[PDB]
């Protein structure tokens, strides 16, 4: 799905949406393409354990440095563990193999920290994938979800992009924390502000990075 997203972006960017002509960004909005899931919080502890995050539905996940993944559903008990060889496994926090004790402990720690100290991005919105991969640049953290969605959070201004290749849409969250979902094809049609245009150009570069970094 990344290749498909890469093309969707190439197209919108090639149209030079903000360059010229009367920009009618509002007409490109498509509330029907609202994202189901997105990362609302994250903690970068990759120096020791890995990346911890919270999805908008309050489920939490961790992509450990050993490429394994642990997902805790919003009921606070159901767990899904993904080994390196894709081996998906179901369980609970109450009944789990002793071997996962360390990883379940770390997830609880992450969950605690996030729920108590971090803001929920998209908290004013009403919307299970796991974190396939992620990386960070000087200006952003890029999150690639297993459902094909790609999220880009810009550190400085706190703006965020949520790219869904299925919907061929992009949800932009501006500094005022406004939540707007646009259909990429319509952005080509009606254009958009310099701000979103710039971030979509960045998005393409990130998508390309994801494609040449995978394995």
């Amino acid at each position: 799905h990344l290749s498909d997203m890469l093309q969707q972006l190439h197209s919108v960017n090639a149209s030079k949406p903000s360059e010229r002509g009367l920009v009618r960004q509002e007409e490109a909005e498509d509330p029907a393409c609202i994202p189901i899931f997105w990362v609302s919080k994250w903690v970068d502890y990759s120096d020791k354990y890995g990346l911890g995050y919270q999805l908008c539905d309050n489920s939490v996940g961790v992509l450990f440095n050993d490429s394994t993944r642990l997902i805790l559903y919003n009921d606070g008990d159901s767990l899904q563990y993904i080994e390196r060889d894709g081996t998906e496994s179901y369980l609970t926090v109450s009944s789990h193999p002793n071997s996962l004790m360390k990883k379940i402990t770390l997830l609880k720690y992450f969950r605690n920290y996030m729920s108590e100290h971090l803001l929920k991005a998209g908290a004013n919105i009403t919307p299970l994938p796991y974190l396939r991969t992620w990386f960070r640049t000087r200006s952003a953290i890029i999150l690639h979800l297993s459902n094909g969605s790609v999220q880009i959070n810009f550190f400085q201004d706190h703006t965020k992009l949520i790219l869904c290749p299925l919907m061929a849409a992009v949800t932009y969250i501006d500094e005022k924390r406004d939540f707007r979902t646009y259909r990429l094809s319509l952005l080509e049609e009606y254009g958009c502000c310099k701000e979103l245009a710039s971030r979509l150009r960045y998005a393409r570069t990130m998508v390309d990075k994801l494609l040449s970094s995978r394995s």
Binding site: V39, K41, V43, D44, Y113, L118, L119, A121
Partner: peptide, 6 residues
């Protein structure tokens, strides 16, 4: 940042 927005 080692974490998202507080």
């Amino acid at each position: 940042x080692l974490h998202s927005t507080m």
